[PDB]
């Protein structure tokens, strides 16, 4: 069985970054020629692994994380980065062993009047831990007076909407991001490249 890479990369809809999707890849053969031949990726960088040898290596388990962010925020999907995405939406660990793949998606996630169905977390007291997902929608308290579930001054909804319009700049345009995590534990390898077993 080949690894399910079309369902992650060819997916008709991606998840919001605050509620990023994680798909477990296991017990399959992984051919990365699907990503090699396609010249649409703006970012293809790997950590602890070279991107060219991925067809020669095997892993015990592979995780595939996917979401949509701005082009100006793609650089925050990397170890040791800071920002609203890295601190409150998606935090890669400093010992991250895997790959980060991103491509422009203005043709798929932009609407004329504005696509407001993609959200990021704007308000949070503390920074996220590595590989942490916060799906909470509780009203954020910016002052000393409790909100009691009511929006107002110093009482705001924690999630915000991207404004994704086709006439936006490349920094404001939507980018689809796939994060591949690799683990090598003392366990049988489930995901292998075609060059290997």
């Amino acid at each position: 069985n080949l690894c399910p890479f079309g369902e992650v990369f060819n997916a008709t809809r991606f998840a919001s970054v605050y509620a990023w999707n994680r798909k477990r890849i296991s017990n399959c053969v992984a051919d990365y020629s699907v990503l090699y031949n396609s010249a649409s990726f703006s970012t293809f960088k790997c950590y602890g692994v070279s991107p060219t040898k991925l067809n020669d290596l095997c892993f015990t388990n592979v995780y595939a994380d996917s979401f949509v962010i701005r082009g100006d925020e793609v650089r925050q999907i990397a170890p040791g980065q800071t920002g609203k995405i890295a601190d409150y939406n998606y935090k890669l660990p400093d010992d991250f062993t895997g790959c980060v793949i991103a491509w422009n998606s203005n043709n798929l996630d932009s609407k004329v009047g504005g696509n407001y169905n993609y959200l990021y977390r704007l308000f949070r007291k503390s920074n996220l831990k590595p590989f942490e997902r916060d799906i909470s929608t509780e009203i954020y308290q910016a002052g000393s007076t409790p909100c009691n579930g009511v929006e107002g001054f110093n009482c705001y909804f924690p999630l915000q909407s991207y404004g994704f319009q086709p006439t936006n700049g490349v920094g404001y345009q939507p980018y689809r991001v796939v994060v591949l995590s690799f683990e090598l534990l003392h366990a049988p390898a489930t995901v292998c490249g075609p060059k290997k077993s």
């Epitope: 990726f41 293809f44 960088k45 790997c46 950590y47 602890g48 692994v49 070279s50 991107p51 060219t52 650089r75 990397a78 170890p79 040791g80 980065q81 400093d94 010992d95 991250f96 062993t97 980060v100």
Partner: nanobody, 124 residues
Framework: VQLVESGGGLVQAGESLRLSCAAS????????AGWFRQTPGKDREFVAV????????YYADSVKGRFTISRDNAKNTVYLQMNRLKPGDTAVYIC????????????????????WGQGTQVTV
């Protein structure tokens, strides 16, 4: 994570110098390590880059055949053996650490890296 450069000073033409960039964390082995120089007044300029495994390297044409890059992940340090130094090489050399890119052209851009350092002033 901190990046500290060392091994800089005053030298003359023809003479050699070796630069080092130590890493605070043992995660240095998973990143690609590159070297940049910012001559005072100008902007950053690429010099060299080494990948995490060391099985692939890329130099700039200005220092190709004169400089050499190496790394030792046990000490979490990059090396830049600078030979045949000319007065134009006088600059603060900064070491950058980021991802291993499928397209090697991304190493030439400074914005494609993640960590940066303080810099060490080399004078020829």
């Amino acid at each position: 994570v901190q990046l500290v450069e060392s091994g800089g000073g005053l030298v003359q033409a023809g003479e050699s110098l070796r630069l080092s960039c130590a890493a605070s964390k043992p995660t240095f082995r998973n990143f690609a390590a590159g070297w940049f120089r910012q001559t005072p007044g100008k902007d950053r300029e690429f010099v060299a880059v080494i990948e995490y495994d060391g099985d692939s390297a890329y130099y700039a044409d200005s220092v190709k055949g004169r400089f050499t890059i190496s790394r030792d992940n046990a000490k979490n340090t990059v090396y830049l053996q600078m030979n045949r130094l000319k007065p134009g090489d006088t600059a603060v050399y900064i070491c950058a650490i980021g991802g291993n890119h499928y397209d090697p052209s991304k190493y030439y851009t400074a914005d494609e890296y993640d960590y940066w350092g303080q810099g060490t002033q080399v004078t020829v």
